[PDB]
């Protein structure tokens with residue numbers, strides 16, 4: 001199990017002002033550290049955050065967090081469940097800031113909620129340095145869904161933080177799972193771009209510096225979209241993305257209720273998969289199966305899906321080798337080309 005530590009700096013808080021924190025399982029003798037960012041959508045105004053506080057309070061508060069959590073999938077310490085990094089130091093960072101890990105605003109006289117996701121990551125890293133992270137060779141910042149977008153938004157800041165703190169030997173890398181979204185037109189016409197734009201102002205949200213300099217003031221929402229922020233990043237980032245991610249379809253107002261799919265929706269879905277595949281063409285480390293699903297890396301059966309005969313744990317291992325010219329039998333760019341969900345036979349059964 002991973003054990004809860006609430007942040008010693010209690011000014012770095014979840015939405016309701018309770019301390020943020022992290023769950024840790026150390027593996028002495030390993031110099032690999034996996035820091036995983038939980039997902040869970042976001043909220044962007046007082047009214048929708050108040051509703052989230054009523055019925056999704058664990059995503060806004062640490063007051064009810066359990067003392068331990070079981071590491072699953074890529075956070076498992078069992079080689080059978082985690083062929084990739086089972087011996088690593090494991091860190092699960094709960095998502096309690098509702099800001100896609102972008103916020104740097106405290107609760108105050110003018111703010112009902114604190115949005116501190118970017119500062120939570122920074123503070124977790126700082127406190128871990130005294131618990132063995134100072135001796136690390138690789139820090140893999142991973143995350144799923146909103147946490148996967150959080151990786152894209154924060155990996156270079158973690159790298160810069162460690163450089164400035166005097167740890168230039170720690171190699172910071174990112175693993176963004178299910179956080180690579182398209183700002184596309186809905187199938188039927190709140191929306192991702194508008195919600196993010198409102199969120200950034202409400203959260204005092206921050207984006208990576210090079211991306212911010214490209215898009216400039218008022219346009220920072222662009223940096224929440226993988227295909228726009230990824231080319232600006234310096235740290236190596238492996239992108240895991242279902243071609244037909246359920247969250248993407250949800251924001252696109254697509255719901256597949258078994259009934260036969262007619263031409264307009266068929267074309268819409270096929271073009272979405274084509275667009276996603278296009279955005280990954282120049283992402284050398286990627287795993288993008290043609291499945292309708294959501295998230296992958298912390299589920300216990302994450303080992304089962306394969307693209308072109310290669311599983312994600314294998315692809316991640318090949319990526320590790322590449323970061324020591326392509327490797328014989330050890331590919332890292334794995335994007336399905338077939339055009340309809342479940343054309344890959346290894347897709348999750350749901």
Ligand SMILES: Cc1ccc(C2=N/C(=C/c3cnn(C)c3)C(=O)O2)cc1C
Pocket residue numbers: 039040041042100144145146147149181192196224225247251295
């Ligand atoms: C720009 C953007 C940023 C984040 C999301 C997003 N974050 C999610 C978190 C989630 C849901 N379930 N779980 C376990 C986690 C999500 O589904 O979509 C979507 C967009 C368009």
Ligand SMILES: *[C@@H]1O[C@H](CO)[C@@H](O)[C@H](O)[C@H]1NC(C)=O
Pocket residue numbers: 009011012119
């Ligand atoms: C605690 O966190 C706040 C917010 O990031 C920061 O301003 C402050 O310097 C931190 N305190 C210490 C002792 O690190």
